[PDB]
Amino acid sequence: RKFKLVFLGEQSVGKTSLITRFMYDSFDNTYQATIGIDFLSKTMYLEDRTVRLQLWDTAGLERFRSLIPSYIRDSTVAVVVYDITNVNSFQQTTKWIDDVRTERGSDVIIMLVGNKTDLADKRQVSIEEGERKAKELNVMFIETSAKAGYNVKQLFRRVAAALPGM
Amino acid sequence: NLSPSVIAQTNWKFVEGLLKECRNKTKRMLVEKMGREAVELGNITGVEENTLIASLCDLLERIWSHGLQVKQGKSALWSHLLHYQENRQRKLAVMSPLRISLIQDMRHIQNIGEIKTDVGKARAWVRLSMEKKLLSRHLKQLLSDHELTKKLYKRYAFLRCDDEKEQFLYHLLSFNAVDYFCFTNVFTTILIPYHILIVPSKKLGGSMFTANPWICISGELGETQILQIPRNVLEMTFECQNLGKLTTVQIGHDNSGLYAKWLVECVMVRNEVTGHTYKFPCGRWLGKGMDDGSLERVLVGELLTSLPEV
Numbered sequence: 493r494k495f496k497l498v499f500l501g502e503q504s505v506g507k508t509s510l511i512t513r514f515m516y517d518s519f520d521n522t523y524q525a526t527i528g529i530d531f532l533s534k535t536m537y538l539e540d541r542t543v544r545l546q547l548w549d550t551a552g553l554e555r556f557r558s559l560i561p562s563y564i565r566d567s568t569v570a571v572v573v574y575d576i577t578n579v580n581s582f583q584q585t586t587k588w589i590d591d592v593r594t595e596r597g598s599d600v601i602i603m604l605v606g607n608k609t610d611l612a613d614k615r616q617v618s619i620e621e622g623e624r625k626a627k628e629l630n631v632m633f634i635e636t637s638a639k640a641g642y643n644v645k646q647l648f649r650r651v652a653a654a655l656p657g658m
Numbered sequence: 659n660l661s662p663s664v665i666a667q668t669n670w671k672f673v674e675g676l677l678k679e680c681r682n683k684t685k686r687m688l689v690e691k692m693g694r695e696a697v698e699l700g701n702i703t704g705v706e707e708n709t710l711i712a713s714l715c716d717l718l719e720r721i722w723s724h725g726l727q728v729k730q731g732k733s734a735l736w737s738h739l740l741h742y743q744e745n746r747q748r749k750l751a752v753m754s755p756l757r758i759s760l761i762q763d764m765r766h767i768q769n770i771g772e773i774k775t776d777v778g779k780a781r782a783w784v785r786l787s788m789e790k791k792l793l794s795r796h797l798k799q800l801l802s803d804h805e806l807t808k809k810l811y812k813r814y815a816f817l818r819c820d821d822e823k824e825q826f827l828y829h830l831l832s833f834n835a836v837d838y839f840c841f842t843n844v845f846t847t848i849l850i851p852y853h854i855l856i857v858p859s860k861k862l863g864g865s866m867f868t869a870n871p872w873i874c875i876s877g878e879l880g881e882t883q884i885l886q887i888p889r890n891v892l893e894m895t896f897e898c899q900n901l902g903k904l905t906t907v908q909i910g911h912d913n914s915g916l917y918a919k920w921l922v923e924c925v926m927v928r929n930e931v932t933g934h935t936y937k938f939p940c941g942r943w944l945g946k947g948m949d950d951g952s953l954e955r956v957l958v959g960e961l962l963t964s965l966p967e968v
């Protein structure tokens with residue numbers, strides 16, 4: 493049994509950095525541009541069950557914007573990631589969730605995520621503002637950070653358990 | 659010899675290798691090209707793109723030669739193409755859109771005399787698809803005839819290995835986010851048909867256009883002779899040596915007749931082989947008395963963005 497998890501967000505919000513935190517428990521603050529799609533898998537070890545998660549790390553670049561709907565096709569789970577230190581990244585966050593439920597049905601487990609909660613320098617979005625739009629649509633919510641590793645596992649734990657299995 | 663099921667695991671390594679390779683090359687060519695589109699005022703990067711495609715093609719050959727009943731052909735990509743082609747032979751303001759089909763673009767390569775090797779045909783086919791932004795699509799479609807891939811490839815093959823094949827296609831999808839002219843810029847002497855479409859401002863004002871119009875299309879590799887358009891013809895497809903990226907278009911008339919006043923909104927020229935469509939904004943009169951009284955005007959073309967994504 494395999495599980496698909498798509499990672500979506502604006503250019504440099506922290507999609508790839510969260511994968512490195514969970515994959516090899518480490519953080520690199522140097523920016524590396526994502527070119528289209530990167531594939532990566534890991535096996536989550538939980539007390540009840542244990543199955544592998546195929547990760548899809550998509551690009552936040554506009555050049556690659558027209559391909560994003562294609563990356564969502566047949567995706568079991570979608571993980572929307574937005575920076576909280578920037579308003580624009582948080583701005584169209586909804587446009588993403590909409591496209592998800594537009595390509596995929598309603599069975600697709602979606603979860604909103606506000607990354608970069610490590611530094612409060614220039615933070616323009618609050619937990620409340622994210623909680624509200626996460627409550628409007630049938631979508632989970634959780635605060636996260638890649639530099640600090642603020643419960644990055646929680647992001648995975650509950651999203652991988654909240655889904656049918658073998 | 660001392661390898662019953664050991665080779666099975668040895669082939670899974672090769673398959674992994676081909677995928678990691680594909681990704682790397684895909685990821686590089688995109689960076690090399692996006693970087694070229696960053697600062698270029700005129701090449702050095704142009705010759706690099708030729709070798710990059712050189713490598714992309716060999717990679718594709720190796721992928722297509724992995725685990726199969728080798729044809730006499732030198733190209734495994736062209737042989738699997740040829741088959742899909744021969745097996746379809748058995749089973750038997752806006753202009754009209756072009757037919758999108760791996761077979762179509764095959765035919766385009768098939769009628770290029772200078773190309774003699776099966777390898778060149780494939781190499782030609784892949785560049786044309788890259789310019790058209792259909793390498794991924796065409797391969798995903800060539801691979802849809804599962805019975806065909808099954809009849810040619812062993813079970814441990816790359817192509818037959820559907821979990822790695824899907825990533826393989828998903829990576830070629832990146833070439834759609836960049837503009838390649840690798841077909842147009844290398845085959846500078848082939849005949850290419852340009853579909854012309856004159857869009858007159860339809861509004862009842864004045865009288866019927868009576869003059870004789872002429873047109874002249876010009877691109878980077880050359881330009882057309884002066885084309886004399888038949889009265890009451892606003893759409894025609896003209897064939898001539900590859901003009902490269904269309905740059906400008908000039909239209910006019912001989913001022914003959916009673917009402918020699920023409921108002922053309924835009925001219926649209928399209929490469930019938932690549933599908934590239936250029937818009938040539940006009941919006942001004944053509945005739946003595948109107949505007950600045952010009953009887954011929956020069957139009958600067960714009961490449962229209964590829965559509966759709968359906």
Ligand SMILES: Nc1nc2c(ncn2[C@@H]2O[C@H](COP(=O)(O)OP(=O)(O)OP(=O)(O)O)[C@@H](O)[C@H]2O)c(=O)[nH]1
Pocket residue numbers: 501502503504505506507508509510520521522523524525526527550551552553607608609610611636637638639640
């Ligand atoms: N301070 C801080 N920086 C972060 C955090 N997450 C990501 N970054 C920074 O963002 C940059 C890299 O961002 P990526 O994670 O690769 O961005 P992305 O979502 O993959 O964007 P694309 O590659 O365009 O798709 C680096 O300079 C990181 O230091 C975080 O939680 N805290």
Ligand SMILES: [Mg+2]
Pocket residue numbers: 507508526549550551552
């Ligand atoms: Mg990324």
